[PDB]
Amino acid sequence: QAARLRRRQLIRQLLERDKTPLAILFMAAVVGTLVGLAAVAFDKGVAWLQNQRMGALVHTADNYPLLLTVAFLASAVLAMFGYFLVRKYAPEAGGSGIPEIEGALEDQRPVRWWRVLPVKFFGGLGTLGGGMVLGREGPTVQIGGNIGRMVLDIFRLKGDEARHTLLATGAAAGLAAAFNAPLAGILFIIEEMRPQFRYTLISIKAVFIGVIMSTIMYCIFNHEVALIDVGKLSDAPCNTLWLYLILGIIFGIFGPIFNKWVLGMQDLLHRVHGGNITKWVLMGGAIGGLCGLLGFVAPATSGGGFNLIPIATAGNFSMGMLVFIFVARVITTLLCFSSGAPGGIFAPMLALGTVLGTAFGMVAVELFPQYHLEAGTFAIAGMGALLAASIRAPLTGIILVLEMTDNYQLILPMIITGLGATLLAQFTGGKPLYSAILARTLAKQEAEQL
């Protein structure tokens, strides 16, 4: 065996460890600043169109059929504009955009920033400003990875590594700016967006710089109200931690069931239009118009879902209301994401996991009155457990819920629920969702090849 030359190379490699060149480190600060500025202008444009829509529903308050007509039509034309931009100019800007950057980090999936960037921005502004059940982390990760490719072409950085670092720097900075979550942005690249089956040269120090330069832009220019702001919930005694494994087992079964509902609704809604230009846009105006109609009446069934998360965690919702919200937010998420709308499924998975967790917590409170439980500790453990059972990135989602809810006393319930979600997803035969979107787009790409 020739391990004494593998030892000789390793001593050389250990003494050049963590030696990113200065051009990659400087350009990662240029990428992350531009990502953090583009994500602020995206959030300021989405929140402008939402308050322009809600302002148009308090003006015509004396005519309820006209008030429901405006709620349908303002969100229809906003979604029809967003569907048209994807279908005419950049078809890879439809859906999340995270498998488009994951496919780009392993050298498939070309990064057409001259098309995707003024499509995923303005078309995600119409779908998310129209009140559809879509996250801003869909657009901002693909906008971020395309900005990192946009700053690879202006300054002409040569190198295989510098392509993979800066494309991953902006994708990390786009997730970090969407959630105000810097640790979850870096951990999304190490765990999920990494090429999982080979060694890649992505400098994590450059991914750090772009995340932090993006989070500094969240300070100066973004002025909002700290998206998830649940309080300081109760502690979790360590004899009740088996109840968070039951919750993770429940999540780990629904997770694979939810993924084949995402992939099945993509094939089901594609048979409606047949890939046609105007039938896809007219269907997307009906999906977006319904979610603007379901944002005036029953408003906790549409939107991204961060509103209902503090109304959950042992709040206003009864058990019959929690069942109705969960079923309706499954249908509206499946209609929004599995249709080609620019917008992610990652943040609607946060709201679907919170509702399932607090519905489980309401049962665990009534069943076990000796543990002195509240329903809100299970809504925090469940919040990142649909991200663990469907996207299969538990380390990102446990950290992300820690960034957003700020309850470290519930961290061991969170890791127990996030583990049992991943374990039972593997046991019941589910794949990670972004891998399965990518495995379908690359199989469709090779089926169009003659």
Added chain:
Amino acid sequence: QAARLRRRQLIRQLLERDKTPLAILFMAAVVGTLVGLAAVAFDKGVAWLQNQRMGALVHTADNYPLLLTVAFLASAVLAMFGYFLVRKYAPEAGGSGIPEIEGALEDQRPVRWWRVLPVKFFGGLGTLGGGMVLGREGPTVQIGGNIGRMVLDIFRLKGDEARHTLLATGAAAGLAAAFNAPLAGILFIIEEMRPQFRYTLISIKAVFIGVIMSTIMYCIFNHEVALIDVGKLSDAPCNTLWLYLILGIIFGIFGPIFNKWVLGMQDLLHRVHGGNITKWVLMGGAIGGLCGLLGFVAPATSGGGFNLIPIATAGNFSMGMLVFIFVARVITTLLCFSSGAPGGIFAPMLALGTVLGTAFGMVAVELFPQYHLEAGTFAIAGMGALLAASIRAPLTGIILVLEMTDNYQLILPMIITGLGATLLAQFTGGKPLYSAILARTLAKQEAEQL
């Protein structure tokens, strides 16, 4: 290129992503429970020996040269027991042990668990029970990684995946149970301890299982106070975050100077004994007995340093006292670690970084009164910043300080300080220290049998 074939390999690989076998997942629960039970017996044995040491200092409280004698001699005999077990039976159990598990994950540096497990336990009990400036995470990561190899030969699991996962499971469970830090245990494997220059199939889901099983054992059998119990501190305004960049620059310059002092004291303490076991044991009794002497008079200059972190962090130290503590704790950290005692640098780097961060925040208060600062926010940022400059694992040290201080409002101060500590350690020529000890160990056993 012929990228038709590598796309088809990617389709097959994404469809069977996250597919750990049942035996590796079940054995990681066996490993993590065993590391969690071995860590609890380690921390209770260190705390029992330290309590019998301070209990002898209340009997002879009237004869002042006598309780200086028995504070020297009780720590000298306990350290001599720790140095004799390493020098006779397991020489790779001296020092931290993180480079020994790092080398083992790259198939150098064999795991002789039949001797390193009784030596690192009872020798680390003698060196930490005597009050040396050493962390217990050194004798818990290596003891954990040996348990993961011990539960590989009893049940006879084969393959490079099972060997590397269970070795990284126990090493992650050893860091998690040493600090009650489950997220920092998982993140230490994905960032520092893994092979850095090749692809390794370490199953990260089984690393979760061992981390969970070790921190669950931290409940049922370990009943002690929190290690660091600093409270809730000031919300750091974003116009003051340039000061945490300067704090990272000071750490990033000192970190390489500290690393040359670690490896430079390893070389000149080795010239005192010359590898002779009797002179090595008598040197470790003088070094370990002095820290028991410094444990009675001026106890802030000795020990693991978790006690002085709440007395720092906007606390009751002066400027001249805090400067005296830093200089005296650098001397005692280098005398304990670089002499080959079982024990780590990781937790005395947390104490050294808190003291340096407190002294920087004390200067920044009197230099910038318009920012309305307190010195404790810079102590939290500084606490993981020597781990960013010396160990060059910023993501683990930022998370580890977040596990044990519970101050998420300083997360953007914590990463700016850790980024500038990693940036200025790279540009001033510093290496990561566990990679520098490993490459010095790998080059040493190469030149004797080449």
